[PDB]
Amino acid sequence: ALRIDSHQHFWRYRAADYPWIGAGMGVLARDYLPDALHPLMHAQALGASIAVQARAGRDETAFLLELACDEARIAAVVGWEDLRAPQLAERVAEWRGTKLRGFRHQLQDEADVRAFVDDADFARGVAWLQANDYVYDVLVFERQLPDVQAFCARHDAHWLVLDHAGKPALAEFDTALARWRAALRELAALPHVVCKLSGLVTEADWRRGLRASDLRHIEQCLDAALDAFGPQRLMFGSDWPVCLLAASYDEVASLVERWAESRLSAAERSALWGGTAARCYALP
Ligand SMILES: [Zn+2]
Fold first, then answer.
1. Which domains does the chain have, with CATH numbers?
2. Phi-psi region for residue 148, left (φ > 0), alpha (ψ -120 to 50) or beta?
């Protein structure tokens, strides 16, 4: 099986273009391009990555596809389009090559997520994506999970990927685990929803710094994801470079590696570390 980092970003940094990079986030306020990622993947023996839109514009899609062209180490792109546009189909057709495998909108930043996802024009777009075998990545905060339950139940025609295991409020674990878990189980009950094991270190209190107690809390979330989704619907992702707010690329991968060695068979680990990503994103 392929060994895939299923979730990473790239950017030529400009402050105004990335409003979510704010104060206390200096590590992110610079360019992150494929050259910077490849040594880290090499050290983890990961052969390829999936690059995911980091801002909302068609030019982000063009940027990522350009980086991915002729670069075997970028296996796919999850791009951005305005899914509500009537023009969606003809716009998607503009993209050349085969590496555009899915889309993502930053739902978490919307004022009314439920209103956003149930919107007729958005539903039309997502329906078109699914009819055309494009994956959709779901990005929400833990408390927004109930807001997308109906959306996920409705759009069952192709794979929906839950980013970062739905962002459990790890900084609160000292009702939080319970609430997130109930929402996670309800989503995992749908066969077409799969789960990224990624983006966990930055849901702990990284500003004050990660502690052993956070690592144990993360393992609880990993265990809950495995219970709900099963071993065939889990995929590793680094969430680099965002993960660097809290931990190194090596620390992020090792955390999942140690957990998987404990809880998974060899075959199940191969699925976790790339097989599931390859089958859901239709990676060659
Ligand atoms: Zn991310």
1. 1-284 (3.20.20.140)
2. alpha
